[PDB]
Amino acid sequence: MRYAETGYVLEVDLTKGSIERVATDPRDTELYLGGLGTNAKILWDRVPPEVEPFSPENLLIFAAGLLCGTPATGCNRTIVSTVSPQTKLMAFSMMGGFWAPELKYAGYDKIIFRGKSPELVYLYINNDKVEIRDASHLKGKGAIETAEIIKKELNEPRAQVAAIGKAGENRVFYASIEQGRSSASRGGIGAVMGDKGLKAVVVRGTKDLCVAKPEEYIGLCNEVLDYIKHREENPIPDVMPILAGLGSPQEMKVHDEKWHTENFNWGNARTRRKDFWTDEVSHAWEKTMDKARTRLISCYNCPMKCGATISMEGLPTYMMKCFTKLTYTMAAYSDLDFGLRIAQKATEYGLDGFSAPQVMAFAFELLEKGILKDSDFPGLPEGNEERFFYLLDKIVNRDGIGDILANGTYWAAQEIGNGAEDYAHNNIKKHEQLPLKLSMLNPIYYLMYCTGEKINITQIEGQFPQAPYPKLEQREAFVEDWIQVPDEKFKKIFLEWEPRGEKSMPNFPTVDMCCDIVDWQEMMHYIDDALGQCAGLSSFPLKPPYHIHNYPKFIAAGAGIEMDTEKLKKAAKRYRTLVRAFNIRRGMRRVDEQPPANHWKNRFPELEKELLDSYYKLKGWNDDGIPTKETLDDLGLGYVGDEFIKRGILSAG
Amino acid sequence: MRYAETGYVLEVDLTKGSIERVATDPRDTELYLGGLGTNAKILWDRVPPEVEPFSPENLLIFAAGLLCGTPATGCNRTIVSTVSPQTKLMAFSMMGGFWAPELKYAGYDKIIFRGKSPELVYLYINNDKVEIRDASHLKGKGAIETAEIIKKELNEPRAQVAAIGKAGENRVFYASIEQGRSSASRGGIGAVMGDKGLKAVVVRGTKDLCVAKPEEYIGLCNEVLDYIKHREENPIPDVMPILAGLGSPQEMKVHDEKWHTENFNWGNARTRRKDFWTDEVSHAWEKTMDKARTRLISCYNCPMKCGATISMEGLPTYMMKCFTKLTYTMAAYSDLDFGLRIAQKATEYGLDGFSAPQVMAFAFELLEKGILKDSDFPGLPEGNEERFFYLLDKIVNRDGIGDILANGTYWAAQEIGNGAEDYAHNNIKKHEQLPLKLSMLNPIYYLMYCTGEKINITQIEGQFPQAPYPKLEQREAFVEDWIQVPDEKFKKIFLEWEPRGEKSMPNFPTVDMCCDIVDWQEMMHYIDDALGQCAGLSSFPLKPPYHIHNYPKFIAAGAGIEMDTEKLKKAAKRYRTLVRAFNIRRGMRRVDEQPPANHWKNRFPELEKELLDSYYKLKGWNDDGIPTKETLDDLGLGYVGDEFIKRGILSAG
Amino acid sequence: KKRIVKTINIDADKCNGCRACEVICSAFHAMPPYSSNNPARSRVRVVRDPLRDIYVPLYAGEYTESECIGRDKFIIDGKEYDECGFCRASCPSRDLFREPDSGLPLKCDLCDGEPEPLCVKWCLVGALSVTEREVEEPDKRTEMEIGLESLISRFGADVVADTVEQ
Amino acid sequence: KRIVKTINIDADKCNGCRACEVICSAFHAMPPYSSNNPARSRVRVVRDPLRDIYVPLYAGEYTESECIGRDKFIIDGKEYDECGFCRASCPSRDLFREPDSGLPLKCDLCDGEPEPLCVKWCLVGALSVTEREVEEPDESVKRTEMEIGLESLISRFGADVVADTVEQLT
Ligand SMILES: CC(C)(COP(=O)(O)OP(=O)(O)OC[C@H]1O[C@@H](n2cnc3c(N)ncnc32)[C@H](O)[C@@H]1OP(=O)(O)O)[C@@H](O)C(=O)NCCC(=O)NCCSC(=O)C1=CCCC=C1
Ligand SMILES: CC(C)(COP(=O)(O)OP(=O)(O)OC[C@H]1O[C@@H](n2cnc3c(N)ncnc32)[C@H](O)[C@@H]1OP(=O)(O)O)[C@@H](O)C(=O)NCCC(=O)NCCSC(=O)C1=CCCC=C1
Ligand SMILES: Nc1nc2c(c(=O)[nH]1)N[C@H]1C(S)=C(S)[C@@H](COP(=O)(O)O)O[C@H]1N2
Ligand SMILES: Nc1nc2c(c(=O)[nH]1)N[C@H]1C(S)=C(S)[C@@H](COP(=O)(O)O)O[C@H]1N2
Ligand SMILES: Nc1nc2c(c(=O)[nH]1)N[C@H]1C(S)=C(S)[C@@H](COP(=O)(O)O)O[C@H]1N2
Ligand SMILES: Nc1nc2c(c(=O)[nH]1)N[C@H]1C(S)=C(S)[C@@H](COP(=O)(O)O)O[C@H]1N2
Ligand code: SF4
Ligand code: SF4
Ligand code: SF4
Ligand code: SF4
Ligand code: SF4
Ligand code: SF4
Ligand code: SF4
Ligand code: SF4
Ligand SMILES: [Mg+2]
Ligand SMILES: [Mg+2]
Ligand SMILES: [W+6]
Ligand SMILES: [W+6]
Prior knowledge:
The complex is a heterotetramer, with 2 copies of chain A (653 residues) and 2 copies of chain C. Chain A has 25 helices and 20 strands. Chain A has 653 residues and is of the alpha+beta class. In chain C, helix 3 packs across helix 4. In chain C, a hairpin with a 2-residue loop joins strand 5 (70-76) and strand 6 (79-80). A two-stranded antiparallel ribbon of chain C has the order 1-7. In chain C, strands 3-4 form a two-stranded antiparallel sheet. Chain C has one domain (1-166). Classes of the chains: A alpha+beta (653), C alpha+beta (166). Chains in contact: A-D, B-C, C-D. At the C-D interface, strand 1, strand 4, strand 5, helix 3 and helix 4 of C face strand 1, strand 4, strand 5, helix 3 and helix 4 of D. The structure holds 1,5 Dienoyl-CoA (4KX) (2 copies), ligand MTE (4 copies), iron/sulfur cluster (8 copies), magnesium ion (2 copies) and tungsten ion (2 copies). Residues 77, 94-97, 182-183, 248, 321-322, 458-459, 528-529, 533-536, 540 of chain B line the site of one copy of the ligand Nc1nc2c(c(=O)[nH]1)N[C@H]1C(S)=C(S)[C@@H](COP(=O)(O)O)O[C@H]1N2. The PDB classes it as oxidoreductase. Keywords: aromatics, reductase, Benzoyl-CoA, anaerobic, oxidoreductase.
C-alpha cells in the first residue's frame, strides 16, 4: 500500500460538472514529496504560458501536505496553487487549521478544479461521496457566515469548510480563501476560485490514515513534543516575546508592539514613527486587546495556540493571528480598536490583510496629491476611519473607483496614470511587500526579496537570526545547542557577525555566507510546504523541533520511502527549481528580481550585483536567473531543459 | 394511618445524649393543627414559669408545618420555639427554604431538645438513623460555612443544615439560626441553641409523605398555581412594586427604595430623611444591586424567587431577602454597598438583622451623648463604616462593651444606666420594633403593636390594605374580586375608608371595625404558622392564593381530618389563645401592651383605651388582657383556666 | 421513512432551584397517583448549589449495570461542577434515578399518556419545555461483518468463536 | 476501601486542537500507531469556536437503547447541543462508536500503559486524572469489552446471524 499520502486525487471539471477519482504516481512522491511540490509538477505540465488567470484552463489546486492527517504535531497545512491574476506568475498559498487533515481522512491528497461553473456552486465531500451543490442562496455571504449555513444545511457539524467572501466572487485580485482561524491569503487565489463560480469546498472524512513504520513514527512525534516543552522553557535570550519562542508571531498573546509600531512604516508604507509607543498607547491597546480577545486557539494537533477568537462590540466573532492585527491600524494611521473592527469586515469579505490596507492607503495618497479627484469618491465621508470603511466596500464590489483599486496598486496605478505609478512604490513582481523601509542594505534580505517565489519576506526567512548579538559570549551561548544547522559553518558565521565594525553588514557576512544562509532558510520553507508542516514549528522560528536532521526520519517512517538528509536537500532543490522554471516559462527574468527602489536608504550596486550573481551560481541558474540545462538534468528535470530549449529560453550548448 | 403529619417526633436530651422517637396524639392535631400550635401545647405543659431561658429545662423545638412535605406550593416553613432570653416570653421564629420539608421526608414533625451538651455537638438525622456527633472542630465557624463542612464530612450533599454562627455560640440575645437562604431570625432562638451546646441540626430524608385525599389535594394545589399566574398578571393598582404582588417584600427584584428610605427612620430609629431618594442615589444603588445580585432563588416548591444570592467583591457568597437589605445601611447612615458587605458578616455570625443594627446605632448615640466613654471602645476607628464593623465583632464575642450590648437595647441600657434608658426608645416587651415614627395614630396598627405575640409588625399585618384609595372607583374595583374576605363587611369598610375627611383615621374605621380587621389579619398568620405555609402566598400580601375559604379544604384533603371555615377559625383562636396564656403565666399583663412612647406624634389616650378594651372583649380576655375562664372552657382549654385559678391569675367567679 | 425524537429543552439560566419539578413528578408516579410524593423517586433531579450558582435540572436516562472506569468532572466558565455532574444514567455509583428503597432504576418517559409533562406544567418560571422533530431512521449488514472482523483482530479468532458460543 | 478515578477536565483551558483525539485513536489502531482516525477516539471534543464551546467528552457506558426524551441545555448563555454532555455509546449518534461497524467504544484510561495518552499530549494541561479511596463497594457487573462488543452485535443483528457469520469467519 501507500502510506501517509492517500494515493488519490479528485479531478473536478466545473464546466461539465464531472468528478473523477484518480490514483497518483508514487514516483512523483519520491521526486517532489507532496503538497507544494506535486502541485508544481501538476501546474508545469498542465498549465502552459498562454493560459490566462481567468481562462477556464487555469487550474485551482487544493493540496494536503504529505504528512497531514498523521500524528505529527502541527502538520495540518493546505497548499492552494494557481496562476495569479495579480502577478501572472505561480501563486501558492498556505492555510492552517483543520481542513487539510480532514481531506486526508476523507481519502484524498488534492482536489484539482478546471473549467468554470455557470452557476455558483460548492463541492461537498464525505469520504467516497462527492457532489456539486447549488450555492446561489449563498451569493454574497461572508466566508465564515457561509461555512455555518452550509454545515446546518447538510447536517454536518464536524465538516471543514474553505470558502470565499464577496471579494472572491467579484474577482478582487487579492481575495483570500477562509476556513475557521485559517486563511490562504495572498496572490489572488480567492479570485480564481470566484472566477470558476466556486463558493466553498466542504469536506468530512472518517477513514483511517496509515503510516509506514508505526513505532518509529510515534517515537519521532514524542521527541518533537519533548522539544517543544523544553524550547518554551528557554526562549531565545534578548529577543522580543512575539518572536522569542515557537509558533507564528505570537501577536495575539503579546500586548507590547513597540518593535512593529516604531520600526515599520505607517500609511502607504510611507511613515516611520520613531517614538510612537508611549505609556498611554501601551495601556490603551492593552485595554482593547484584553476586552476583544475571547480565547487563544490552536490549529489541528498543536499546543501553541497562536490564533485568537476576537469579539468586538456589535460585530460577529471572527478569528485572527499574526500581523493583520496591525496592518489596517497602521495603513490608516489609527488605533488597535479600529484595526480589529475593520479586520472583521475584511475577513468576512475574504481579502488579503497585507495588500488590501496598502491599496487603500495608496488610494488616499492619490486623492491627497490630487492625482485622483474627490469626484472619483462619491459620498466620501469626512472622518478618516469612515473613509477606510467606505473604500473597503467600494473595492469588494468593484464599484466605480473600487473597480480599479480591486486590481492592486501595480495595475491600478498603471491604469490611472498621471504619475500614479510613483506611489505604487512597494511592489516586487507586482506584489505588495511588508511596509519596511530601512536604512542600511541587508545582503541576506536583499537576496530573499529578489528571488523568493512566494514574494513575501515573512515566508522565506527564519532559521538564521535577524541580527547579531553585541557580545561574543551571547553568541557562544546561542550556537552551543544549535542542533538544527545543516553544517558547522553556520555557527561560525553567527559567532563572527557583529552589530558594528568590520564584521558588520553590508560587508559581512560575506557574499558566499549570505548565499548559504538564504539557501538554508528557503529550503526549510519548501520542505514545510511539501509536508504540510506548520512553519510555526519549523522554518519560521529560531531553533525549531523539526529540522533537516529529523525530517528525513519523519518522511521515511511516515510515507515508507527512502530518505536521508542529502536526498531531502536534493528533493527540496528539485521542486524549488521546478517552481522557478514555471515562472521562467511565464516570462520572469533577472530584471524582475529587484526590491523596491526606496527599500533601503543606503544602496551598494556592485555588492548587490555580486550577491545575485553568486546566488544564481549556487542555485545552478543563468546570470539571467534561468535554471541551466546541466542543473536541470542533474535534478531529473530533463523534460524541463528540453522544453526550455524548444521554446528558445535556453540556447542549446 | 395519619396523613400529612408523620405522627412522630424526636425527643433529644443533650445532657444525657439520649434520643427517642415518640408517636404523637392525633387529638392534638384536631385541636392545635401543627407547627406553632402544637409547639405551644408542648411549651405550656412542659415549661412552667420558674424555668429560665438558659436553664437545661428550657426546650428548643424545631417543628415542620402540618402540610410541609406535601405538594402544596410554598408550604415549607420551620417553626422554632423556646423561651426568649431577651423578652422572657415565648419566642417563636419562622424559617423558610428546604429544611422542614426534609424533616418530613425523614419521618418527623418536630425535634424537641432539652438539657445541655457539655461539648459542642450537632445532630445528624438520616431517615431512621439519628445520632449526636462531635462538632468541636466547627467551633466559631459561620453558619453557612458550617453547613458546607458538615455536608462534606458526612458525604451528604443533599442534606439540609440549620446552624448557628459565633453569635449563637456566645449566647447573643438576638442570635439567629441559618439555613441556606433562610433564617429563624428573632427572639434569641440561636442563643438558646448555643446555650444547649448545639452547633447544627443536619437532616436527610428519602421516605414518602402521604396525603389523605390524593386527587382532591392536587386539585387544590393546581388551583393555587392558576391563581398565582393570574395574580401576578394583576398587581394591586397604585401600590409600589415591592408590595404589589405575591411573595415576601420583593426587595431583591426592585431597585426603587423611595418608600423605605423616605418614610422609615435612619440611625437608632432616629432620623426621617424626607427627600433622600435622589437621581444620584437611585442610579448608585442600582449599580450596586445589579453587580451584587447573582440569581433570584426560591424556597422549596415555590415560583416566586423572593431571595437572592449576593456576591460582594472579596467576600464569600451569601443569601438575602426582604428588609435586611436596608436595615444596616440605614442604622449607619450609609449606602447600599455598605449594607450588603456588613450583612454578609452578620449573616455568618448568625445575628438578627432587625435588632442588631439598632443595638449598634443605640450604642453610638450613647458614645455621642457621652453616656458611654471612648474608653469603653478600645481602638475605636475613626471612620463610621469601620466603627460598625468594629462593634459587630465586639458584640458577637461578648467582648468588653460588646458583652453588655449583646443583651439588646433594653437590658444594655438598664445595665448602663445614666439616662441610657432614654435612648432605648423603640422597644415593645423588651423587643426592638421596625424603625418607624409616624405622625398620626393609626388605630389598626396600634392594636397590632400592643398585642402581637411575635412582637413584630411585619408578621401580623397584611390581609387588609395599609392605606385607603383616594377615589371611590378605585375602591370599588378593588373589592370587586376580593374573594379572600371572611365576610362582606370587610369590603364595605374599605369602600368608606378615605385618606382625608370624616372617614379618615384615627376616627375611622370605627373601633369595632378595627378590632375585626386585626383579628382577621392575625388569624391568617396563625394559620400559616401552624400549616407551614409561607406567608408570602397567604397572610402577608393582598389577595393571596391561600385564604380562609380554601384552607379548610387543604387541611381536610391533606391531613384527613374534619375541617370547615368555622372549625378553622376556632382552631386558630384556640392556639392563639394558648400562646397568650403561656405569656400571661410568665408575667405579661395589659401594662406591657403599649407601643413606644414616641411612636406617633399625635396620640389619643381615650380612643387608644377604647380600642384595647374592645379588642380584649373580642378576644374574650380580661381588661388586664387575660383569657377568661368562660372563653378558655369554650375553646377546650379548661386545663388552662383551672391552672390560672390555682395560680391566682384568675379569681374563681 | 422517518421517526419523531422529543427533546427536553432545559434553560438552566432560568432555573430558581425550587425543586417543584421533583415534587410533582414523584407525586404523579405514586400509587395511586398523588397519594404521596418523595423527591428521591423523581425522574427529574436538580443539581443545586447556590454557592456555586449551579441550578441544573437533570432527567433520568439509561440504565447501566456498571460504573465507568474513570468518572468525568468539568470546569466550565469558571464553575467547578460535580463528578458525573451531567450524567443521566441509573448507575451503581450513586442513588440518583434509583428507587430509595429497592434501588431499581427510574426512567423519564415524558409522562407518557398524559396531556403534558407535569414537571414542565409546574415550572411556573418556564425553564423547561419539550419539543419534537422528525428524523430519518437508518438505511447495514456490512457493518456486522466489519465489526466481527474487528473483534477477531483485537482479541483473536479462537477467543471470539468460543465466546459467541455462550 | 476501593479506588475511584476521576478525569478532570478544565474546559476553560482547552484550545480545541484535538491532539487528544489524534493520540487516543493512534494508540488503539491495530497494530498500535499504524494509523489514526479521530472518529475512533474514546475522547471526543465538542468544538464550536463561534459559541466559544470547547468541551472534551470521554466515552462511557454502552446503552442499547435511546432515551425517550433527549436533553438540551442553555447554561451561562451558551446553547449546548442536544445530549451534549452524554458519555453513552448510544444508537442515536456516531460518537463513541466505530465509524464503520457501530461497535461501542469506552475509555479505559489507557489500561496497562504507564499513563493516559490524551493527558500526555495535552500540553496546555486541560486534562488530568486523579484517584481517591472510597468505602462504597463496587456493585458493577464487570463485562469485558469483548463480551460487550459481541452482545451489541447480537442485539442489532440476531444470535443465529452473528453465530453463523462467526463460524464462516473461523
Ligand atoms: C528590523 C530591524 C530592527 C532593523 O534594525 P536597525 O533599525 O538597526 O536597522 P537600520 O534601519 O538599517 O539602521 C539603523 C541605523 O544604524 C545605521 N547602521 C546600519 N548598519 C550599520 C553598520 N554596520 N555600521 C554603522 N551604522 C550602521 C543606519 O545607517 C541607521 O542610522 P540612522 O539612524 O542615522 O538612519 C532588525 O530586526 C533587522 O535587522 N531585521 C532584519 C531585516 C528585516 O527587514 N527584518 C524584518 C522582516 S519582517 C518580520 O520580521 C516580521 C513581520 C511581521 C510580524 C512578524 C515579524
Ligand atoms: C407608612 C406610611 C407611608 C405612613 O403614611 P404617611 O407619611 O402618610 O403617614 P403620617 O406620617 O402618619 O402622616 C403624614 C402627614 O399627614 C398628616 N395626616 C395624617 N392623617 C391625617 C388625616 N386623617 N387628616 C389630615 N392630615 C392627616 C400627618 O399629620 C402628617 O402631616 P405633617 O407632614 O404636617 O407632619 C403608610 O404606608 C402607612 O401608614 N402604613 C401603614 C402603617 C405602617 O407603619 N406600615 C408599615 C409597617 S412595616 C412594613 O410594612 C414593611 C417593612 C419592611 C419591608 C416590608 C414592609
Ligand atoms: N508550511 C507553512 N506554514 C506556515 C506558513 C507558511 O508559509 N508555510 N506561514 C506561517 C505564518 S508567518 C502565519 S501568520 C500562519 C498563517 O496561518 P493561516 O495560513 O492558517 O492563516 O501560518 C504559518 N505557518
Ligand atoms: N485574510 C487574511 N489575510 C492574511 C492573513 C490572514 O490571516 N487572513 N495573514 C497574514 C500573515 S501574518 C501572513 S504570513 C500571510 C500568509 O500568506 P499566505 O496565506 O498566502 O500563505 O498572509 C497575511 N494575510
Ligand atoms: N409562615 C410564615 N411565612 C413567612 C413569614 C412568617 O412570619 N410566617 N415571614 C415572611 C417574611 S416578612 C419574610 S422576609 C420571609 C423570611 O424568610 P426566612 O424566614 O426563611 O428567612 O418569610 C416570609 N414568610
Ligand atoms: N439574620 C437575619 N435576620 C432577619 C432576617 C434575615 O433574613 N436574616 N429577616 C428580617 C425580616 S424582613 C423578617 S420578616 C424577620 C422574620 O423573623 P423570624 O425569622 O424570627 O420569623 O427577621 C428579620 N431578621
Ligand atoms: S504553531 Fe501556531 S499557527 Fe502553527 S499549527 Fe500550531 S497553533 Fe497553528
Ligand atoms: S414566596 Fe418567596 S419567601 Fe415564600 S416560599 Fe416562595 S420564594 Fe420563599
Ligand atoms: S420547577 Fe423549574 S425553576 Fe424550579 S427547580 Fe424545577 S426546572 Fe428549576
Ligand atoms: S454516573 Fe454516569 S458518568 Fe458516572 S460512573 Fe455512572 S455511568 Fe459513568
Ligand atoms: S416528563 Fe414526566 S416523567 Fe419525565 S421528569 Fe417530567 S414529570 Fe417526571
Ligand atoms: S489536547 Fe487538550 S486542549 Fe487540545 S483539544 Fe484535547 S483537551 Fe483540548
Ligand atoms: S445519547 Fe445519552 S442522553 Fe442522548 S439519548 Fe442516547 S443515552 Fe440518552
Ligand atoms: S485515557 Fe487513554 S483510552 Fe481514555 S480517552 Fe485518553 S487516550 Fe483514550
Ligand atoms: Mg495562510
Ligand atoms: Mg425567618
Ligand atoms: W505571518
Ligand atoms: W420580612
